[PDB]
Amino acid sequence: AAEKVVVNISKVDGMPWFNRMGEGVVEAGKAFGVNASQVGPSSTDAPQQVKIIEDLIARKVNAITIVPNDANVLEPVFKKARDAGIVVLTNESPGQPSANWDIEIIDNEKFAAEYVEHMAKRMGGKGGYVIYVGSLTVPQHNLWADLLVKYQKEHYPDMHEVTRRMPVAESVDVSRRTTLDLMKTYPDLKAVVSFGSNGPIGAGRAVKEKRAKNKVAVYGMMIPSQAASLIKSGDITEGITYDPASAGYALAAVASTLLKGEEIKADVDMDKRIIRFHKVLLVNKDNIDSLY
Ligand SMILES: OC[C@]1(O)OC[C@@H](O)[C@H]1O
């Protein structure tokens, strides 16, 4: 008979991050004997993900995996997928109610700690910072940001957010303009953190334009090839982030296991429904050339 069908859904198409994720999805399909694909929505508007899922339910797929733009917007349609007998997995949505499992490639608490310790060392434990998130509701960016700020307050009291987190991390242009604006406004701004993959690109371009790389550090999630030029020029300080092909691969792998009626085999937290690895990738001037 035909292979079972596994479909991943990214946050939005046309992104290096999600093209790399898709490579992992497709490779896992070959590895595990499932018909695996990835659909990229036209925008980050969460209803576009809902519409894709409705289409996939209609087409009777076996598993749907997804990087949610908004956990709560998707809950009703995830319930409909589960009612249809479809396995639903998320990445970047710990605690998603209606997903069989959420998969993460890093440990949230350790990841936030690493951001703060890296930032504090370069800032001497003192100064302003800002966080960019993809949106005000996207799940993981906001959990990571929460943990970062909490950790900072409990370790380095002389560091401080210059503003509330800014929902700009999915746009290079907007991230760039925001960074220019903040650098002009806040003399003590010493670091920009972006949890979305486009934000370090925009921030790094702003820092470059203002010739500010020794004053304003840039950290965040990123694809090495996208960030390489700015890393080399020193305008992006460091990527603290993971290989999204691992996420794509793990999603399709776990789907395959469930579809084969097998028990899950990482930290597997049964009651929280989270499968977690700890595969942090640091991206810096010393290793950039090894990474793309
Ligand atoms: O730009 C896409 C993205 O937001 O960046 C990193 C990761 O969180 C991913 O979902």
Author numbering: 27 to 291, 302 to 328
Sentences from the paper on this structure:
For example, we recently identified the accessory ʟ-arabinose uptake (Aau) system in the attaching and effacing pathotype enterohaemorrhagic E. coli (EHEC). Aau is encoded widely by EHEC strains on a specific genomic island and is activated exclusively in response to ʟ-arabinose-mediated regulation, enabling enhanced growth on this sugar and a competitive advantage in the murine gut. In addition, substrate binding proteins (SBPs) are typically encoded at the same locus and capture target substrates, dictating the specificity of the cognate transporter. Here, we show that Aau displays a > 200-fold higher affinity for the monosaccharide D-ribulose, over ʟ-arabinose.
